[PDB]
Amino acid sequence: KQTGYLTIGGQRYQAEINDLENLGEMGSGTCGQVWKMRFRKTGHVIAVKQMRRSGNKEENKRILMDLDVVLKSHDCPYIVQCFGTFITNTDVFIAMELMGTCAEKLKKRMQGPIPERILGKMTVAIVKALYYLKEKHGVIHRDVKPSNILLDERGQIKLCDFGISGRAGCAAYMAPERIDPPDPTKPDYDIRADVWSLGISLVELATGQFPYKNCKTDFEVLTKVLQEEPPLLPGHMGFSGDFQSFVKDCLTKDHRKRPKYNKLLEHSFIKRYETLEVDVASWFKDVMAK
């Protein structure tokens, strides 16, 4: 790998950091400070993550760990693409494709449920992203959630933040088998805990509310996951039978029964939103403009 260049859309300039104008930070980063930045030759805007050599040794490790994955996933359309990097005596700058926002912040702006047609095209993207990292690189995300699903003005939906990926994330979306690992721990007991997390997220974004109510502590959530029934989609909101049975499949608590990505990608709910046209781009711009 190299650090001189910026490969965008087939081209590849050879600039340094000062060739970019800093237009501000895009929220307090949890895996590195992220700036929205603009070229001085052309005016094109990108996202640029900064790792200070002086930074916390633990954040920096995750920044480099997320960088390790996104350098290897250029050919996956459903993962935030990295354009290149710069290494100065004091910083590392990671150039990323500029995205609109996360689905967690999208939910707060909507002030309500997100339509099924959008969650549809989201499901196809995340599952295929989680599947690519598994099949091609044997990596698991280990922290899927609405704040890790980025959308943009063009209607793209990509997964991000592989900071704790590997060959413990947020507790609310953690899978049953990660909360209490099996009696003898097989190395790949973890291989499908991400499916359960995306199911929790789909229920959250579809209903506008997190399915485990009134937990004042992290552990209290963990106990509901294991004691209460899986929180399937309600019946009184016009959700289709395909959407409800896909959410039921992912939310099967017994991990030896949760279907592999192999057959989740066969699901009708997926096959519909592969060939179905949905103007997520226009729907995105509208909620933002609101």
Contact string (CB under 6 A) for ligand H8Z, positions 23-42, x = contact:
---xx-x----x--------
Smallest distance from ligand H8Z to CB 99, Å:
3
SS3 label, residue 152: coil
| Phi, psi (deg, nearest 5) at residue 241 | -65, -35
| Contact assessment for residue 125 and residue 158, using Cβ atoms and an 8 Å cutoff | yes
Question: Minimum CB separation from ligand H8Z for residue 176, in Å?
Answer: 26
Question: Can you tell me which residue has the tokens 């949905």?
Answer: 278
Pick the stretch among 21-29, 56-64, 162-170, 238-246 that binds ligand H8Z (CB under 6 A).
21-29
To the question of whether residue 207 is assigned a binding role by annotation, the answer is: no
Which residue among 73, 147, 197, 201 contacts ligand H8Z (CB under 6 A)? Answer: 147
- Should residue 67 be labelled a site residue for ligand H8Z when binding is judged by CB under 6 A? no
Number of residues lying near ligand H8Z (CB under 6 A): 17
The answer to whether 28 is annotated as binding is yes
Q: Is 143 a catalytic residue?
A: yes
Q: Is 199 annotated as a binding residue?
A: no
288 in a labelled binding site: no
Regarding 98 and contact with ligand H8Z (CB under 6 A), the answer is yes
Give the separation between CA 199 and CA 183, rounded to whole angstroms.
25
CA 78 to CA 104: how far, in whole Å? 18
Task: Determine the residue type at 250.
Answer: C
Helical residues (DSSP H) of the chain, grouped into ranges: 57-72, 103-110, 116-137, 176-179, 193-207, 218-227, 241-250, 261-264, 268-275, 280-289
Beta-carbon neighbour count of residue 125 at 10 Å?
21
Q: Considering the complex, state which of residue 151 and residue 233 has its C-beta at the smaller distance from ligand H8Z.
A: 151
- Give the distance between the most distant pair of CA atoms in the chain: 60
Binding site residues for ATP, as ranges?
Answer: 26-34, 49
Q: Which residues bind ligand H8Z (CB under 6 A)?
A: 26-27, 29, 34, 47, 80, 96-99, 101-102, 104-105, 147, 150, 160
